[PDB]
Design a protein around this nucleic acid. Structure first.
Ligand SMILES: [Mg+2]
Ligand SMILES: [Mg+2]
Ligand SMILES: [Mg+2]
Ligand SMILES: [Mg+2]
Ligand SMILES: [Mg+2]
Ligand SMILES: [Mg+2]
Ligand SMILES: [Mg+2]
Ligand SMILES: [Mg+2]
Ligand SMILES: [Mg+2]
Ligand SMILES: [Mg+2]
Ligand SMILES: [Mg+2]
Ligand SMILES: [Mg+2]
Ligand SMILES: [Mg+2]
Ligand SMILES: [Mg+2]
Ligand SMILES: [Mg+2]
Ligand SMILES: [Mg+2]
Ligand SMILES: [Mg+2]
Ligand SMILES: [Mg+2]
Ligand SMILES: [Mg+2]
Ligand SMILES: [Mg+2]
Ligand SMILES: [Mg+2]
Ligand SMILES: [Mg+2]
Ligand SMILES: [Mg+2]
Ligand SMILES: [Mg+2]
Ligand SMILES: [Mg+2]
Ligand SMILES: [Mg+2]
Ligand SMILES: [Mg+2]
Ligand SMILES: [Mg+2]
Ligand SMILES: [Mg+2]
Ligand SMILES: [Mg+2]
Ligand SMILES: [Mg+2]
Ligand SMILES: [Mg+2]
Ligand SMILES: [Mg+2]
Ligand SMILES: [Mg+2]
Ligand SMILES: [Mg+2]
Lengths: 136, 76, 58, 94, 117
RNA sequence: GCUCAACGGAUAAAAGGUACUCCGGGGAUAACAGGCUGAUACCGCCCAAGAGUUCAUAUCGACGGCGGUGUUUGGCACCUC
RNA sequence: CCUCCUAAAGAGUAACGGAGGAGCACGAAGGUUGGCUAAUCCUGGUCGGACAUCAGGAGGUUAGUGCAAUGGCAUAAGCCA
RNA sequence: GGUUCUCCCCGAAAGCUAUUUAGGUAGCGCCUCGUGAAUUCAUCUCCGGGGGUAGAGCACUGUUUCGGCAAGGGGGUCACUUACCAACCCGAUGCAAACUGCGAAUACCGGAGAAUGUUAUCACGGGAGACACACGGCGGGUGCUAACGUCCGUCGUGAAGAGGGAAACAACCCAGACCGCCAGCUAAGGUCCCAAAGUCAUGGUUAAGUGGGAAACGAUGUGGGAAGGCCCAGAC
RNA sequence: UGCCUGGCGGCCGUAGCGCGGUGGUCCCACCUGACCCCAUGCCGAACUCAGAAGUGAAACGCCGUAGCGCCGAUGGUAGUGUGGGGUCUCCCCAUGCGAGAGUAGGGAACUGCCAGGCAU
């Protein structure tokens, strides 16, 4: 399960998730799983999808995870009123804008990479597309 | 432990912008450090406040090898 | 300069304060009020800010 | 030999470029040499099927701008964030 | 720091204060072999008067160009030339060198000759 | 010469109980019910590693995903003091 | 009471929002004149080691500032007489 | 809690600061009346300014993945070595309210000029009210980018605003009612009937009463477009 | 008038760094000597004084060179003021403003006052 090893600060303002993605190209492998949607990926969703695609390629080839869940998410428990300080950190998300290449793969035939990515995509809360490496 | 504290805003910043006619003594900029340095006809106070040493027009300029900000007073 | 005619075309109700200030600057009083003004860039600046609610006849 | 047909852009900017893409066309630039850069428009479908071939990025292409022929090389490509579309192409005079 | 850069650093504060005061300055330069003196206008881009040991007219009547006696000669020379052009009030710029020996001899000579500083 | 620190400092000088209670008021403000919300809850689905001798989907189903209801635990304080 | 963010590129701007600090110190740790320039890493060196002091090189203020933070600071505001 | 005749002009606030203060009060802000004073003030144009926000970026502060190179830590040695871990440095890839070697749009300050505006401006003096705000838009904090939630900023409307539209519906859209008319034109929104106005014209799509509630996901539903594989050496 | 050098400025990396070459009559530098003026929390390293046997090695100046820094379009993209709109956590249209990064390319500074050496 991915998570920052240490952080300058514990908690972070909600913020917004406007704009288009940076890192929209297959830069390490031969194939990629690109986000078409906008949303948050939790560390558990990222791991769930990583496990699915790894089992699929029978632990042959190489996998890259282009996303990192560095955003701390707080939550107020049940029977707790409003105020009295910001809630406690429970999980970590990665903000996802349309275009982000989430995962990359190489060392496997296109057909297999396509299936592995089909299996991982089902564990994600946002719409994805299969992408291939390009000459510029 | 608990948060909840903050200090009073110190009302710092530029008091007289470029071109403004000032009488000698008028504070041009209240700042924490020397974000702006005193140029010609401009004095520097103990709290790094820049003030007019002569009547005239406020002039902002970038001078020197360190590309620093300077406030000067041009005669009008 | 030459004279132009400006007419308020929409209501000032709900308009930004600056836009109401501009309509006062043109002397436009009510919807449909046509007014004769000198075609200078200052008058043309005012016309531009409140363009959506005035019609110009040159 | 890749032959691309193009028209000169009668307009420039955000508004005008977005209007081309809605009209199944896309802006592109030709620069390099002593010559002034030429702002051009391309048919999306045509260039899209061409760039599918690896040779497009290596070979010298000919751009036909109002009769005139211009030998160029694909310098840079701005692709759509997630769709299989082209946003803009940089062509350098060869 | 190397000798030259270290000297310029030592000279910077006084030169900036003199610039600020808009004072006419008598700039002294010293070398193992020679001693120089220039009277520079407040703008700092134009010389009003100058004298040194590289000048044939001064070096001729001196034993060695790089000693306290030569310095006193250059000192007397600038003040005389400055007074001929009406330049009376100046500010001494030691230019990173200590106000001592040769530098002092030049400044004491200029003061004697009639220059006011 | 005051941690007059409740720091524009009611006095030099001050803690509690009331289910024995009382008055003026408030739905400006809690408890019941309504309302908004739906995190929680309950119900359903998507993916399918695996269980099922053999076989994912007879019956189940991990890691994760999307909803529906207003229905529990709650949030809010809009209605009635 | 002080510092930063929230604060929407002048000022100001709320919550039982997110983070910290003050209620002192100093006759020099003040004034001025004159001078000086860190951190960190690599190489070599009695005891001596990952790290003490010494020498060279890289580095260029990331050091330092009595103390929180931010803005400053080489003409140093840093360090010495 | 209540506060009694009429007409006319103007017209708030629900904010800041302090308060044994918090549903009270005081100063300031905003209203009104009077006196005085400048082209005083507003819009726009041109001119003179400072930004560190949006965006972006990754040198700095942190954080992050892949590759390359590697001081150092952990296990065998009886200094040498290892299928481990690995800071720095180099190349590649991201992330930031409390990062910035970049950096807008706006906004704000100042100068000049015209037009317009019943002085709208400033000062002094008389009289106040008000310091429970609400919703909607934009930018945020908090909360679950939950609440007709809560807390700031900024604009609009309601408050204190009738008329037309959104079935009904303070706060949304259009629009600001001095009085009379059995005239006319328009706005939002509409034109088959209830119900004023097109069963209007032209060209397409849909067959679900979709229109007239809802997602991941699923499917030879159907319209348009560009390409491609196989095929009379006989494809499906 | 030209070439070279020193000083003092303008400007503040198109101006800096690196690499290669190059200069000593003059200037500059290292250099020689040190009792003394003056100096070292020790040291003539530095500061300083008296000089001229040596050398341009270092430094410094100049010339060359795109390895790095630096400057940098055009076009597109991001954002955003105003008006409008949607499927309204986010977008789109009209209009105005319009980055940052990257790309082509530029680039081995430019300039004033005074003084000294040399040459015509
Ligand atoms: Mg636009
Ligand atoms: Mg108090
Ligand atoms: Mg009672
Ligand atoms: Mg209530
Ligand atoms: Mg209840
Ligand atoms: Mg409330
Ligand atoms: Mg009720
Ligand atoms: Mg501010
Ligand atoms: Mg602002
Ligand atoms: Mg100190
Ligand atoms: Mg000093
Ligand atoms: Mg060592
Ligand atoms: Mg009125
Ligand atoms: Mg009190
Ligand atoms: Mg301007
Ligand atoms: Mg941002
Ligand atoms: Mg690595
Ligand atoms: Mg008054
Ligand atoms: Mg009150
Ligand atoms: Mg209140
Ligand atoms: Mg409020
Ligand atoms: Mg509310
Ligand atoms: Mg009321
Ligand atoms: Mg009705
Ligand atoms: Mg009808
Ligand atoms: Mg329906
Ligand atoms: Mg067959
Ligand atoms: Mg020596
Ligand atoms: Mg040499
Ligand atoms: Mg432009
Ligand atoms: Mg720019
Ligand atoms: Mg640019
Ligand atoms: Mg750049
Ligand atoms: Mg070049
Ligand atoms: Mg000469």
């Amino acid at each position: 399960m991915l998570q920052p090893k240490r952080t300058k600060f514990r908690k972070m303002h909600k913020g917004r998730n406007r704009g288009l993605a940076q890192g929209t190209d297959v830069s390490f492998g031969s194939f990629g799983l690109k986000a078409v949607g906008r949303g948050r990926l939790t560390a558990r969703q990222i791991e769930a999808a990583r496990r699915a695609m790894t089992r699929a390629v029978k632990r042959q080839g190489k996998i890259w995870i282009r996303v990192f869940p560095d955003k701390p998410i707080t939550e107020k428990p049940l029977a707790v009123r409003m105020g009295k300080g910001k809630g406690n950190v429970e999980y970590w998300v990665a903000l996802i804008q349309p275009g982000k290449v989430l995962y990359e793969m190489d060392g496997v035939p296109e057909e297999l990479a396509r299936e592995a990515f089909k299996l991982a995509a089902a564990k994600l809360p946002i719409k994805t597309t299969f992408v291939t490496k390009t000459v510029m | 432990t608990r948060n909840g504290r903050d200090s009073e805003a110190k009302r710092l910043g530029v008091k007289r912008f470029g071109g403004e006619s000032v009488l000698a003594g008028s504070i041009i900029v209240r700042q924490r450090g020397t974000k702006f340095h005193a140029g010609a006809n401009v004095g520097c106070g103990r709290d790094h406040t820049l003030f007019a040493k002569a009547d005239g027009k406020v002039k902002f300029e970038v001078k020197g090898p360190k590309n620093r900000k300077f406030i000067s007073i041009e005669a009008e | 300069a030459k004279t132009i005619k400006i007419t308020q075309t929409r209501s000032a109700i709900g308009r930004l304060p600056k836009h109401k200030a501009t309509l006062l600057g043109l002397g436009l009083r009510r919807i449909g009020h046509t007014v004769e003004r000198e075609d200078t860039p200052a008058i043309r600046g005012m016309i531009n800010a409140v363009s959506f609610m005035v019609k110009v006849e040159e | 030999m890749f032959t691309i047909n193009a028209e000169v852009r009668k307009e420039q900017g955000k508004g005008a470029s977005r209007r081309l893409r809605a009209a199944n066309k896309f802006p592109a630039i030709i620069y390099g040499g002593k010559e002034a850069p030429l702002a051009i428009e391309l048919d999306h479908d045509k260039v899209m099927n061409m760039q599918a071939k690896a040779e497009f990025y290596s070979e010298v292409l000919t751009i036909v701008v109002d009769g005139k022929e211009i030998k160029v090389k694909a310098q840079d490509v701005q692709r759509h964030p997630y769709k299989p579309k082209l946003q803009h192409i940089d062509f350098v005079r060869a | 720091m190397d000798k030259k850069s270290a000297r310029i650093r030592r000279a910077t504060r006084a030169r900036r204060k003199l610039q600020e005061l808009g004072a006419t300055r008598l700039v002294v330069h010293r070398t193992p072999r020679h001693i120089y003196a220039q009277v520079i206008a407040p703008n700092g881009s134009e010389v009003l008067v100058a004298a040194s040991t590289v000048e044939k007219a001064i070096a001729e009547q001196l034993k060695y160009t790089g000693n306290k006696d030569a310095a006193a000669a250059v000192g007397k020379a600038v003040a005389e030339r400055a007074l001929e052009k009406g330049i009376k009030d100046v500010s001494f710029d030691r230019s990173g060198f200590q106000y001592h020996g040769r530098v002092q001899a030049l400044a004491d000579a200029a003061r004697e000759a009639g220059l006011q500083f």
